[PDB]
Design a protein around this ligand. Structure first.
Ligand SMILES: CN(C)c1ccc(CN)cc1
Length: 147
């Protein structure tokens, strides 16, 4: 019926159907369109007190809770989707990953290199598509597949 990992859902506020991908946590109103050796992605990471390494270039000791980290991620997704902000601009300013200095770009990679939830979301995204919140042991990610 639908591309890998998509399902129909219904908006609780409007009643209109939408589509949800349980691998990327993406959601969209329109019926989704539709694997390569390698993909290229950028990401924006928000770490929290239970991250594997609760430290980043932004903060020596990262103290925010997982719930507070998810709220930050949600707010960034909102501004990226509204066009108020660019993904690259928010990644440079707020990503708790050293790749912030590269607008979040992680380069190209194959299966077997990245943490599994990140890898699965990256390979399920279409070119140009962006994920919802993706959880790994490092924290919470917004992933943009660029190639
Ligand atoms: C792609 N991936 C799982 C990833 C996780 C954490 C960081 C930050 N050190 C960078 C990349």
């Amino acid at each position: 019926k639908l591309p890998p990992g998509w399902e129909k859902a219904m908006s609780r506020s409007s009643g209109r159907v939408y589509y949800f991908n349980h691998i990327t946590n993406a959601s969209q109103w329109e019926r989704p369109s539709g694997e390569p050796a390698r993909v290229r992605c950028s990401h924006l990471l928000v770490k929290h007190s239970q991250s594997r390494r609760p430290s980043s270039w932004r903060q020596e000791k990262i103290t925010r809770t997982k719930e507070e980290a998810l709220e930050l991620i949600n707010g960034y997704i909102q501004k990226i989707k509204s066009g108020e902000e660019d993904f690259e601009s928010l990644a440079s300013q707020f990503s708790d990953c050293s790749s912030a200095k590269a607008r979040g770009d992680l380069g190209a990679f194959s299966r077997g290199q990245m943490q599994k939830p990140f890898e699965d979301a990256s390979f399920a995204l279409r070119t140009g598509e962006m994920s919802g919140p993706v959880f790994t042991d490092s924290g919470i990610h917004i992933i943009l597949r660029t190639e």
